[PDB]
């Protein structure tokens, strides 16, 4: 088989965890615990499989303390991604399911490690395209691991050489230009910055955005048209004012007005120092 490809029958596929926007995750064993994501694209064309293999070559060299380890992929019996298995819960489970009570010094540190991992991704010219608290894990409760980055080639079904991109999964983290799907490529470093802005909202408010709106199609249209944005008044009283300003800059409707992660990381680190 190919480089970093896991041959058939090597991974002992165990219990089914759940499905997301582009795959179904299973707990597996392969030189330790692994997460195996059976991709929704089961019938890839040689053109798509080659573009997927080229992207695996990129993702497998993204190694960083805040980046979920990419362990390889499978083609038989089906297309699959093999990553490090995270003990514990994702940031989404901590905030919105378990309702873990963090102190502000720990919430700032979660945002700081996330900005650290995102800065590394953009330094390697990699767009995450799917940043959300579901893809941020508090590994063994301390280290932040960002997962489900890149993989643009299998987040859509291919018509030979051209791919139609459709929204999948949750939309709460999608930038207005990602919602519209109208520009040449809606995904960029700045769209990741917006998703990071929504994650900052979750940390500093304890809530998902648009809690008062249960109509999803209203959210898609008004966010895409620029008529709707997260209510920054929901921010808790103990949130540092510099964090609310940074949050507002990441959530700018125009992507040209959002800061980049070198500046974002520098602001979070300064606020972590200028803090009781």
């Amino acid at each position: 088989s190919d480089d970093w490809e896991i041959p058939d029958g090597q991974i002992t596929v165990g219990q089914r965890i759940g499905s997301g926007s582009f795959g179904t995750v299973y707990k597996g064993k392969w030189h330790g615990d692994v997460a195996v994501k059976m991709l929704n694209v089961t019938a890839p064309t040689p053109q798509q499989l080659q573009a997927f293999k080229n992207e695996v070559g990129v993702l497998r060299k993204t190694r960083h303390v805040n980046i979920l380890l990419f362990m390889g992929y499978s083609t038989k019996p089906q297309l699959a991604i093999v990553t490090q298995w995270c003990e514990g819960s994702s940031l989404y489970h901590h905030l919105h399911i378990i309702e873990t009570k963090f102190e502000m010094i720990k919430l700032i540190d979660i945002a700081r490690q996330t900005a650290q991992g995102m800065d590394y991704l953009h330094a390697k010219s990699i767009i995450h395209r799917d940043l959300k608290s579901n893809n941020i894990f508090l590994h063994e409760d301390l280290t932040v691991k960002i997962g489900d980055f890149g993989l643009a080639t299998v987040k859509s079904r291919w018509s030979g050489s051209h791919q139609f991109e459709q929204l999948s999964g949750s939309i709460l983290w999608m930038a207005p230009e990602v919602i519209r799907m109208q520009d040449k490529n809606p995904y960029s470093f700045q769209s990741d910055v917006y998703a990071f802005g929504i994650v900052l909202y979750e940390l500093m408010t304890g809530q998902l955005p648009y809690s008062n709106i249960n109509n999803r199609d209203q959210i898609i249209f008004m966010v895409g048209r620029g008529y709707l944005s997260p209510d920054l008044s929901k921010v808790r009283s103990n949130c540092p004012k510099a964090m609310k300003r940074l949050m507002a800059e990441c959530l700018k409707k125009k992507r040209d007005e959002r800061p980049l992660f070198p500046q974002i990381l520098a602001s979070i680190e300064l606020l972590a120092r200028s803090l009781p």
Binding site: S168, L172, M181, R216, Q218, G224
Partner: protein, 314 residues
Amino acid sequence: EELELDEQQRKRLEAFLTQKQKVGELKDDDFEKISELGAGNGGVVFKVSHKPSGLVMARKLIHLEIKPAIRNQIIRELQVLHECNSPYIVGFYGAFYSDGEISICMEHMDGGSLDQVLKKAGRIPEQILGKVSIAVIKGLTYLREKHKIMHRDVKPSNILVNSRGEIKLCDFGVSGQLIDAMANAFVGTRSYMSPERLQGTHYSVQSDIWSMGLSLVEMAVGRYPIPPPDAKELELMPMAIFELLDYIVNEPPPKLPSGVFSLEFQDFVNKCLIKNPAERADLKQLMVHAFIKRSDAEEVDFAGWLCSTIGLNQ
């Protein structure tokens, strides 16, 4: 029961309540998988056998990553479905939680959804769509009058039919917590949402009427009508989700093709698709429309047409 039932509708409603009393508490190990009935953007439906009762049910399983307090409230609000009993509403057996999945057990409809029937029929005849409109109108009227429920998801995939000729609504918003939970979790590729609710304006069941007229146009021409068919495509007689929503808001509503449908049917869907939610006809106005009064009088062997379209036996 105390509703406008004919003697056959009341007997079937009684028979359903009878079978429902054989169903005690629903548990995951009391079920046996038969086959899959289909999957949506946020759920999967299976034909199952409730072994303690012998009943065959349609079991929908929704996997939501929510806090248990919200989940327990969702299971609570779904218990209202025990009191939604109408010839135009899909029956209900129970809603419970197990193994991280919300289970909604309902009556199995062997004709599938009108979305499935649409693909097998190509197009649905106008005289058949008259019987569907009466069922959708009376189903929306039952939910709003007897329960103050708004459907919020009227579309062909949520109108179910069976070989007995019954046409029933399903997947309506009995649980507001469930609507918000799935708004955060999934997305679709199309939308039947009215233009005013897309902009955050709430006009009660006027939006459900928009969704019905949109569904009637799709089933009449055999194609989702946003955007409208382009010239030569019509005489044969890939937009993203945001563009579809932007089109519903900023463009004139779709309409039936001229000539091939009766003027009463064309006027009926036009009154259903007026972008102004107040000028849009309401449930009482539609029930006395010329198209409904004509279809209510027509004798249409819907059960015979359905099994013929699907391939079943009478």
